[PDB]
């Protein structure tokens, strides 16, 4: 299958490439090779961008 995560908190983007998301959105991680900022895609909104990795939990 597919692995997904859930947002634990709201986040409003603080750079142009960050993803804004609402607590409870379901996210897929596209790439985590850059440390604590993961490149994610929201299954909830269809948007894509960097997220702070401490804002998600496993589904």
From Swiss-Prot:
**How is this chain modified after translation?**
The phosphorylated form is termed pp60c-src.
Q: Which residues form a coiled coil?
A: none
Ranges of residues in domain SH3 = 1-59
Q: Where in the cell is it found?
A: Cell membrane; Mitochondrion inner membrane; Endosome membrane; Nucleus
Tissue specificity field: Expressed to high levels, and with a high degree of kinase activity, in certain fully differentiated cells such as neurons, platelets and macrophages. Isoform 1 is widely expressed. Isoform 2 is expressed only in the muscle.
What family name appears in the similarity comment? Answer: Belongs to the protein kinase superfamily. Tyr protein kinase family. SRC subfamily.
Q: How is this protein organized at the quaternary level?
A: Forms a complex with polyoma virus middle T antigen. Interacts with AFAP-110. Interacts with GJA1 and PXN.
Q: What is known about what this protein does?
A: Non-receptor protein tyrosine kinase which is activated following engagement of many different classes of cellular receptors including immune response receptors, integrins and other adhesion receptors, receptor protein tyrosine kinases, G protein-coupled receptors as well as cytokine receptors. Participates in signaling pathways that control a diverse spectrum of biological activities including gene transcription, immune response, cell adhesion, cell cycle progression, apoptosis, migration, and transformation.
Protein name, entry field:
Proto-oncogene tyrosine-protein kinase Src
Q: What is the lineage of its organism?
A: Eukaryota, Metazoa, Chordata, Craniata, Vertebrata
Parent-record interval covered = 82 to 140 of 533
